[PDB]
Amino acid sequence: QIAWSENVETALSSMGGGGDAAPLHSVLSNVEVTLNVLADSVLMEQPPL
Numbered sequence: 001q002i003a004w005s006e007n008v009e010t011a012l013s014s015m016g017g018g019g020d021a022a023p024l025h026s027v028l029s030n031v032e033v034t035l036n037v038l039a040d041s042v043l044m045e046q047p048p049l
Contacts (some may be wrong), residue, residue: 004031 011023
């Protein structure tokens with residue numbers, strides 16, 4: 001949560017110049033990428049913790 005919050009804060013601060021392109025997409029992509037790994041890592045067998 002902290003990493004996501006800092007990333008979004010930095011991206012919004014950078015974008016503050018009247019919509020400077022869209023770095024937020026990268027952040028969003030990052031989340032999706034991470035999510036994909038989780039969606040791949042839950043199918044296998046894992047310890048309960």
